[PDB]
Amino acid sequence: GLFGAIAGFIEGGWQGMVDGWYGYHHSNEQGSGYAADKESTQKAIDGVTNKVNSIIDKMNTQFEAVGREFNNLERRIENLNKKMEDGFLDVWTYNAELLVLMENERTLDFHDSNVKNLYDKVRLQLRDNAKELGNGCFEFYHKCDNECMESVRNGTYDYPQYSEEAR
């Protein structure tokens, strides 16, 4: 994908993370588990929902009565209606099919972006207090207990507290 995270450097998804779209998995001496990033998940839900609603709500619907009211000596006028009808069918069919293909590309790239941004936010907090493995994971040079792991998820990780131990 465009942003290189989903099915990219982050090679697959987590069946074990059931309560959100994006998040974290931690592993330390106390145990391991998955935690959803609530903020990024909700923003993504709001964005995709708005896109779908916009595709639906922006359609102008109005009353029309479609029948076949021309007789056997009005075939030229009947053909005029046929070309019009078929024309609109062609237009809406093409635009509907392409809209779906194009927006589906955008949605998946949107998810990819969100994951990449979450990754970068963690990377910048940790800096050199942890090793970037290349698979979505960071390997700490210091012990990071459940409270320390929470501070990373919170955006509250205190780098200068662990610097010396990292050395």
Partner: peptide, 14 residues
């Protein structure tokens, strides 16, 4: 074994 934290995304049975 050193501690780690990983970034990832949701999967399911769809």
């Amino acid at each position: 074994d050193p501690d780690q934290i990983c970034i990832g995304y949701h999967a399911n049975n769809s």
